[PDB]
């Protein structure tokens, strides 16, 4: 709620991409009005991102060990890991970087 | 009520998707037994939709612009818009098309 949002704002990935902030500021209202849900907030916020290590054609075994691990995460971490995985497949976001964002959120929760 | 059901059945999105029609059939009983409200009926029914335009990747601006417009809609139109936005973000349902569906429900109301 206000909780998952704070945790989101606590993320280092979030803090290094000012575009994500300008996004959360302009999206959080519709989340308060119950127009959209947290999953949507994350997709909309992380879609504005633009700065992160890139790795093309990342190996399948690593991808799968990241997903088996994400599959076992706690609520908040899972939603973030999954949203970020979108960036890994569609924008080549380095898998290790994703693994760190997940680790970090894994702790905040 | 036996008014929203009719408004729902009036939407082209509903008429062009027989799947939504079947859904409504299986879902409405729980609505009558009062386990779910109509906003829920809307979500469930639309989750069954299959036919619609898929605009992949819609710039954040367009999104926020559609949400603030949805924000000031009437009750039924707000409910219909919110359920459809789920598809927008989760299935890349065209924002234009979405706007259309929302206009039509805005009218019936």
Got the DSSP string for B12-67?
Answer: HHHHT-HHHHHHHHHHHHHHHTTSS-HHHHHHHHHHT-----B-----HHHHHHHH
Q: What is the resolution of this structure in A?
A: 2.6
Distance from CA of B39 to the nearest CA of A (A): 12
Q: How was this structure determined?
A: X-ray
Write the CA distances from B8 to A16, A33, B39, B51, B79, integer angstroms: 44, 23, 11, 16, 11
Q: Which fold has domain A1-109?
A: Histone Acetyltransferase; Chain A (1.20.920)
Count of C-beta atoms within a 10 Å radius of residue A44:
23
CB contact under 8 A, B71 and A26: no
Beta-carbon separation of B67 and A35 below 8 A: yes
Contact across the interface for B64 and A26, Cβ inside 8 Å: yes
Q: Distance between CA atoms of A80 and A39, rounded to whole angstroms?
A: 8
Please report where in the chains the tokens 């605009």 appear, as a residue.
Answer: B55
Q: Which residue of B has its CA nearest to A49?
A: B60
**Which residues are registered as beta bridge partners of B93?**
B54
* Residue B100 to residue A42: CA distance in whole angstroms: 26
- Which of A27, A39, A43 has the CB atom closest to B64's CB atom? A27
Q: Which of B60, B55, B63, B62 is nearest to B94 (CA)?
A: B55
């Amino acid at each position: 709620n206000d909780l998952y949002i704070n945790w989101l704002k606590s993320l280092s990935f979030f803090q290094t991409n000012s575009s994500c902030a300008e996004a959360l500021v302009k999206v959080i209202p519709h989340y308060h009005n119950k127009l959209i849900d947290f999953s949507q907030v994350l997709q909309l916020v992380f879609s504005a991102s633009e700065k992160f290590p890139i790795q093309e054609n990342q190996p399948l075994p690593e991808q799968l060990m990241f997903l088996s691990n994400l599959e076992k995460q706690t609520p908040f971490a899972k939603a973030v890991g999954s949203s970020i995985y979108k960036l890994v497949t569609g924008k080549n976001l380095s898998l290790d970087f994703a693994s760190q964002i997940l680790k970090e959120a894994s702790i905040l929760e």
